[PDB]
Amino acid sequence: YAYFMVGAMGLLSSAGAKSTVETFISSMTATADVLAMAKVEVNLAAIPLGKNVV
Amino acid sequence: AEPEHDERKRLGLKTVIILSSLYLLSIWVKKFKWAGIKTRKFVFNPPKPRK
Amino acid sequence: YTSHLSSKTGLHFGRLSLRSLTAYAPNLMLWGGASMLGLFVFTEGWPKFQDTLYKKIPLLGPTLED
Amino acid sequence: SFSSLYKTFFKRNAVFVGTIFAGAFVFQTVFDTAITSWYENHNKGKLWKDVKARIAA
Amino acid sequence: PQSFTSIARIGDYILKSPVLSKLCVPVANQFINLAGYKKLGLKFDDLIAEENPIMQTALRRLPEDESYARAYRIIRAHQTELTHHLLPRNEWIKAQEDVPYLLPYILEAEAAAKEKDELDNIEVSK
Amino acid sequence: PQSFTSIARIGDYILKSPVLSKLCVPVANQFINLAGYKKLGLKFDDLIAEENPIMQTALRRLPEDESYARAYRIIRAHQTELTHHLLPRNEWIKAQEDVPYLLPYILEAEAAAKEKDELDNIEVSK
Amino acid sequence: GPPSGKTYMGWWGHMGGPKQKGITSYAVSPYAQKPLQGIFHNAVFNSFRRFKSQFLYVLIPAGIYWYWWKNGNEYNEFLYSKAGREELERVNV
Amino acid sequence: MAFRKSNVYLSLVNSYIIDSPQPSSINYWWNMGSLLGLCLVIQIVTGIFMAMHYSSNIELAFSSVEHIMRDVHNGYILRYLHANGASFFFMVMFMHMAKGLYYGSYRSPRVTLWNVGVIIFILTIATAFLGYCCVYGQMSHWGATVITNLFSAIPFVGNDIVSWLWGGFSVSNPTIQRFFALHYLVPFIIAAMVIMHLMALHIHGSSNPLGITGNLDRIPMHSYFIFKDLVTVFLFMLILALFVFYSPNTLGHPDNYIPGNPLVTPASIVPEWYLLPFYAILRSIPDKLLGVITMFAAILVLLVLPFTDRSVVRGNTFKVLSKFFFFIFVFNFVLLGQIGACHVEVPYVLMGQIATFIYFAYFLIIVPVISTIENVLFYIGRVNK
Amino acid sequence: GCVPIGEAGDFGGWFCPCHGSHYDISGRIRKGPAPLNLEIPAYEFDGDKVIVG
Ligand code: HEM
Ligand code: HEM
Ligand SMILES: COc1c(O)c(C)c(C/C=C(\C)CC/C=C(\C)CC/C=C(\C)CC/C=C(/C)CC/C=C(\C)CCC=C(C)C)c(O)c1OC
Ligand code: FES
């Protein structure tokens, strides 16, 4: 019984610690506004032969 | 003002339940291992007055 | 034993002996097992690790749908 | 008898920690699912899941 | 911190006079009984701060048979305060048993220390 | 860290062979001459470090006179290096008097330490 | 404080080094000493003898690596000097 | 009992500063290390006074540095002092390590000190890279991108971890904000590690240059050695002033003074002077995983130098071959940095690969065989029969 | 992850300034620690223009 109480404490503490670590780490991950997908258009008809367009 | 209420309340409910359970468990364990000293006794038997 | 007892010396790098390692082999083996078990426990948000965890346990963890 | 349970689970710390972690994992998942379900059905028509169906016609 | 020489002077002055005694001793006993240490097992020869050097010398001067009793009283008090109960109303300290045995061992040492600390700042004498 | 059992074995093997001895004695002498420690006033029986407990046991076995002389030599070396000078060319440690006085007190204890580290891991035998 | 582990050096009075006897250190005090007793003789002579006694130990490595670096450089600029088709392609390619 | 040993707040300073039995024969390198610590503290102070007037955006980070260098009363002194104090800090850091290698300090008594020191080293390299990213010049941005992409070598977790640390698909506001916050934080952790280094040091004191026991005579720090640290720090302060006033841009490169532009790259991408040795070995071995692992191998080898040398006689003052090999090692290091700074061409690749081989070999195999030769020669020469 | 310089290298294509990845005119690694060729993004041509996203 005593060890089962200690184990319940350990299990709940582990769940809580995992959740807190998840919160703290995912606070540093990519934000929402940094998720802008970029579409670009290039005038190929204006590109000369011996030139690189970037 | 805070387009984050739904998940805030859900998370709060989860945290409250987890913490209340852990509080009760901790109360129990403190009552447990502290009992090793709370129930002790002392029987003072004075020594023989020799010096 | 008259007279020499024919002692033999076990292999050892100072302190650890072959006997101790033989005794501890399953212990460390499933200690590594438990360590990786806890590692799976700790990680849950990685889409790669979540994707890996979804298939191996399909009767307990079918939680991906919106 | 509980002697078997003790000598298979709580005699050895390695298995004890393994079981505590596995139980933590399964508990976390099932607990999250249950709490989300309860918080959901507790508000019928207050969550966008049914509003998106109601608006559709 | 406040030496027991001044306390002794004020106490003698208050107690010697009849009218102030009659007006002040009735409330002192009620004050002590309402204080609290009496029931929990403390004698007033123990509750004082016992860390400053002059009290340290006084403690060093105590005979064995009182130091041991003081040790028992303080440890039992620690225990009972730990368990949040109170002692049963049979092993308390009676009204007539709160006798000060540690007071003279403080007054003598305090007088010696005070009248030695002054002796250095002596004058040419005349 | 490297025991003197292996060093002694290698040394005896090199010295026993006559041709290899004729090959390696002159280079050894010239090396120890250019080593730069005879002049400043050191015997090689001191340069060995004093962190291993076996070294502590070795020193604790020394007689009084050698320990005192070693102390004098080491402190004088400290001072002379502090000055940046070298000793005068009268007390340079002569080659013929670089006797080994401490090696046996290393080997005698090293053998005991090795057999202690071995005998613990004995087998039941037959 | 709790007792600590064994140590080969202590504080003043319990250094723990081997006990010595017969050593007799002297002094002169700094005020009545005229600090720069030797300031040019000691300087020049000791500096030059110490430079002599530890000269090779830096001359040899520095010279070795300088020769190496010079050879590498000279080959490098020989590569990019009217030799990019005959010498470059036989090692680079 | 004297008040110098009663008050705890002052008892500590007594035990570490006022009275500590340093050995008699100490040369100027221990003072070199103390000067190093004082350089750290002046760097921290001027860094705080720098940050009180520094923005933290990415469109407003270069403007902040030009503002602090041009349009603030007595400001450019601060910025050049921070930069050149860092460069001198790395100079003295390498000098302190070289002394440690040479004189036998890394040996058994202070393995913990050696470990804490190499931890401080990797921390310091991280701090310098972070700060060098804080400027967001032209080449600094490329360096940040390269290092934050180094971790992509790890299998399986190669794109998740970078996407976490980088905080985005490209170097942008979160990246620089994160880098600046870390660059501010980590020096305090360095200070904590310095405290740990001191505690692990004082347990057994310093070592004699002769490699001999120092438990015979000793003299206190203050009134003898405090003046030695004072003179060496006066020398450092004057040389640093010479750099920070007369010739400011000599311990660096003239590319940080360029607005960030993820469109073009300089002709040659080079780190600052104190990283070229740890950059040549990257071009050395042409496997991405091999390079990423071999950097940390180049540090772990310093970790494993203890219980590798096996000469019973500490130090390299009395081992001609060992000290000659040490000097060829130090010239190897400088040659490695130089060969890194120059471009990758036909002879240079062979130069660098041979340099890496002989460098790692000196750490691994040269030291033990040379040590055994030294021990056996010493044993045979002085004995006759 | 550092831009190769155009019209430079050992194969007339691209050269990594960081540690020398010689990308041919096709765009494949020849010499250098780079283990993969340079990945080609998705695109859809539309007449005299093109869109990439
Ligand atoms: C913040 C950086 C550091 C500080 C402040 C520091 C501080 C000190 C101090 C005060 C000493 C005593 C004498 C001296 O000043 O040199 C010392 C000695 C020493 N330090 Fe450090 N140190 C630092 C970095 C390192 C590093 C990175 C290493 C090794 C990787 C190291 C290894 C040593 C060693 C071996 C000694 C030996 C002293 C002896 O043998 O006599 N230190 N350090
Ligand atoms: C902890 C306090 C510190 C602060 C507040 C601080 C702040 C700064 C700032 C603002 C810059 C310039 C930012 C930029 O140019 O955009 C900088 C640069 C730098 N810092 Fe720090 N710093 C601190 C500590 C350190 C330490 C401890 C070191 C290394 C020992 C260090 C090394 C550098 C280096 C090398 C640069 C070079 C980049 C440039 O020249 O600006 N800093 N620091
Ligand atoms: C592209 O050309 C190059 C180039 O090729 C190379 C090699 C380099 C050289 C660069 C390097 C060698 C990179 C080295 C840099 C690092 C290793 C830094 C990496 C970053 C970190 C390690 C972050 C550290 C931050 C922390 C907060 C550490 C965490 C702290 C902990 C865990 C302690 C917690 C505290 C307590 C009390 C427990 C260049 O700079 C460069 O550009 C010119
Ligand atoms: S970045 Fe391409 S080889 Fe260096």
Short mmCIF file of C-alpha atoms in Angstrom, two decimals, chain H residues 202-383:
data_model
loop_
_atom_site.label_atom_id
_atom_site.label_comp_id
_atom_site.label_asym_id
_atom_site.label_seq_id
_atom_site.Cartn_x
_atom_site.Cartn_y
_atom_site.Cartn_z
CA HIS H 202 41.35 25.34 -3.72
CA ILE H 203 40.82 21.79 -2.48
CA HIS H 204 44.38 20.93 -3.51
CA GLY H 205 46.02 24.24 -4.43
CA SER H 206 48.19 25.05 -7.41
CA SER H 207 51.06 23.04 -8.89
CA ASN H 208 54.77 23.75 -9.00
CA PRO H 209 56.30 24.53 -12.41
CA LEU H 210 59.01 22.03 -11.51
CA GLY H 211 56.39 19.30 -11.20
CA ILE H 212 57.34 18.69 -7.57
CA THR H 213 55.41 18.60 -4.32
CA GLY H 214 54.56 22.09 -3.10
CA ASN H 215 53.78 21.02 0.46
CA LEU H 216 57.18 22.25 1.71
CA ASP H 217 56.99 26.06 1.84
CA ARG H 218 54.35 28.55 0.79
CA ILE H 219 53.62 32.27 0.86
CA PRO H 220 50.26 34.01 1.00
CA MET H 221 48.36 35.69 -1.80
CA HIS H 222 48.01 39.25 -0.56
CA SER H 223 50.98 41.62 -0.26
CA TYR H 224 53.06 39.21 -2.35
CA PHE H 225 51.02 37.94 -5.29
CA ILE H 226 48.34 40.61 -5.50
CA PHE H 227 51.06 42.95 -6.78
CA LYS H 228 52.13 40.39 -9.38
CA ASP H 229 48.58 40.15 -10.66
CA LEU H 230 48.51 43.94 -10.58
CA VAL H 231 51.60 44.28 -12.78
CA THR H 232 50.47 41.67 -15.28
CA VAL H 233 47.03 43.27 -15.50
CA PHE H 234 48.65 46.66 -16.01
CA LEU H 235 50.51 45.16 -18.96
CA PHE H 236 47.27 43.72 -20.30
CA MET H 237 45.41 46.99 -19.82
CA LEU H 238 48.07 48.96 -21.67
CA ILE H 239 48.22 46.54 -24.61
CA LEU H 240 44.42 46.47 -24.78
CA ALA H 241 44.41 50.27 -24.77
CA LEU H 242 46.95 50.25 -27.58
CA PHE H 243 44.58 48.07 -29.60
CA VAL H 244 41.33 49.82 -28.67
CA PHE H 245 42.69 53.26 -29.57
CA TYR H 246 45.57 53.08 -32.05
CA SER H 247 44.67 50.05 -34.21
CA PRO H 248 41.11 48.90 -33.47
CA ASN H 249 40.47 46.53 -36.39
CA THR H 250 43.38 44.11 -36.29
CA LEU H 251 41.99 41.29 -34.14
CA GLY H 252 39.01 40.87 -36.47
CA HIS H 253 37.68 41.18 -40.03
CA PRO H 254 36.02 44.06 -41.90
CA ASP H 255 32.84 42.18 -42.78
CA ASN H 256 30.73 42.56 -39.63
CA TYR H 257 30.23 46.20 -40.65
CA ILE H 258 27.82 45.19 -43.41
CA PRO H 259 24.00 45.07 -43.30
CA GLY H 260 22.58 41.56 -43.21
CA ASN H 261 21.78 40.32 -46.72
CA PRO H 262 20.69 36.69 -47.33
CA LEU H 263 21.25 37.22 -51.07
CA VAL H 264 25.04 37.14 -51.51
CA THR H 265 27.97 35.80 -49.53
CA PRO H 266 31.54 37.11 -49.08
CA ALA H 267 34.41 35.78 -51.16
CA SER H 268 35.72 33.85 -48.14
CA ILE H 269 33.70 32.84 -45.09
CA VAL H 270 35.99 32.75 -42.06
CA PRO H 271 35.33 32.74 -38.30
CA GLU H 272 37.15 35.06 -35.95
CA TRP H 273 40.80 34.41 -35.23
CA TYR H 274 40.07 32.13 -32.26
CA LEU H 275 38.06 29.56 -34.25
CA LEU H 276 40.19 28.87 -37.33
CA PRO H 277 41.78 25.73 -35.79
CA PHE H 278 38.30 24.40 -35.04
CA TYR H 279 37.29 25.25 -38.61
CA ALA H 280 40.12 23.71 -40.62
CA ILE H 281 39.23 20.22 -39.41
CA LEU H 282 35.71 20.72 -40.77
CA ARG H 283 36.99 21.06 -44.33
CA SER H 284 39.48 18.30 -43.48
CA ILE H 285 37.25 15.21 -43.48
CA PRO H 286 34.55 15.39 -46.21
CA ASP H 287 31.73 13.64 -44.36
CA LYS H 288 29.07 15.82 -42.73
CA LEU H 289 28.46 13.41 -39.86
CA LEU H 290 32.21 12.94 -39.51
CA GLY H 291 32.82 16.67 -39.17
CA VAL H 292 29.99 17.25 -36.72
CA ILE H 293 31.21 14.38 -34.56
CA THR H 294 34.90 15.25 -34.90
CA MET H 295 34.50 18.77 -33.50
CA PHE H 296 33.14 17.39 -30.25
CA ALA H 297 35.83 14.73 -30.59
CA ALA H 298 38.45 17.50 -30.67
CA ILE H 299 37.03 18.64 -27.34
CA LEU H 300 36.52 15.17 -25.86
CA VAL H 301 40.18 14.49 -26.57
CA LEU H 302 41.11 17.29 -24.19
CA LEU H 303 38.70 15.57 -21.82
CA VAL H 304 40.52 12.24 -22.23
CA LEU H 305 44.06 13.60 -21.89
CA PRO H 306 44.05 12.50 -18.21
CA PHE H 307 44.98 8.85 -17.64
CA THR H 308 46.62 8.94 -21.07
CA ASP H 309 50.04 10.36 -20.23
CA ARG H 310 51.85 7.75 -18.17
CA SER H 311 55.18 9.29 -17.26
CA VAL H 312 55.69 8.94 -13.53
CA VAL H 313 57.36 12.39 -13.54
CA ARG H 314 54.90 15.27 -13.86
CA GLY H 315 55.43 18.20 -16.18
CA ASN H 316 57.51 18.64 -19.31
CA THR H 317 60.37 20.78 -18.03
CA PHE H 318 62.55 17.67 -17.59
CA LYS H 319 61.58 15.71 -20.73
CA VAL H 320 63.31 17.11 -23.80
CA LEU H 321 61.51 14.93 -26.34
CA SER H 322 58.12 15.47 -24.72
CA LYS H 323 58.47 19.25 -24.64
CA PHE H 324 59.81 19.34 -28.20
CA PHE H 325 56.73 17.42 -29.28
CA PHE H 326 54.61 19.88 -27.31
CA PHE H 327 56.14 22.73 -29.28
CA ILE H 328 55.53 20.96 -32.58
CA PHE H 329 51.96 20.53 -31.31
CA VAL H 330 51.49 24.24 -30.64
CA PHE H 331 52.91 25.12 -34.03
CA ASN H 332 50.57 22.45 -35.40
CA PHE H 333 47.67 24.34 -33.85
CA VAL H 334 48.70 27.68 -35.31
CA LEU H 335 49.35 26.07 -38.70
CA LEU H 336 45.91 24.46 -38.52
CA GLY H 337 44.26 27.81 -37.92
CA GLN H 338 46.26 29.41 -40.72
CA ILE H 339 45.55 26.61 -43.20
CA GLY H 340 41.88 26.99 -42.36
CA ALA H 341 41.92 30.74 -42.99
CA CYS H 342 43.43 30.25 -46.43
CA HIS H 343 41.23 28.75 -49.10
CA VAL H 344 40.63 25.09 -49.93
CA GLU H 345 42.86 24.29 -52.92
CA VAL H 346 45.24 21.60 -54.14
CA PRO H 347 48.02 21.59 -51.50
CA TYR H 348 45.88 22.96 -48.70
CA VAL H 349 43.66 19.88 -48.41
CA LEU H 350 46.68 17.62 -47.90
CA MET H 351 48.13 20.17 -45.49
CA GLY H 352 44.99 20.21 -43.38
CA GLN H 353 44.38 16.47 -43.42
CA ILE H 354 47.95 15.72 -42.36
CA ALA H 355 47.65 18.42 -39.71
CA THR H 356 44.50 16.87 -38.26
CA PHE H 357 46.09 13.43 -38.28
CA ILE H 358 49.24 14.53 -36.47
CA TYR H 359 47.19 16.66 -34.05
CA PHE H 360 44.84 13.89 -32.95
CA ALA H 361 47.77 11.47 -32.99
CA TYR H 362 49.77 13.69 -30.65
CA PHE H 363 46.85 13.66 -28.27
CA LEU H 364 46.26 9.92 -28.61
CA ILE H 365 49.41 7.98 -29.51
CA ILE H 366 52.45 10.30 -29.46
CA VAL H 367 52.09 11.20 -25.78
CA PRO H 368 51.97 7.62 -24.39
CA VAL H 369 54.79 6.16 -26.48
CA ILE H 370 56.99 9.20 -25.86
CA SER H 371 56.15 9.04 -22.16
CA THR H 372 57.12 5.38 -21.93
CA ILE H 373 60.37 6.04 -23.79
CA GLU H 374 61.12 8.86 -21.35
CA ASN H 375 60.41 6.73 -18.31
CA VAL H 376 62.52 3.81 -19.51
CA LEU H 377 65.44 6.06 -20.47
CA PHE H 378 65.36 7.71 -17.06
CA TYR H 379 65.24 4.33 -15.36
CA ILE H 380 68.11 2.82 -17.33
CA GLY H 381 70.48 5.80 -17.49
CA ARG H 382 70.87 6.41 -13.76
CA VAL H 383 71.18 2.71 -12.85
#
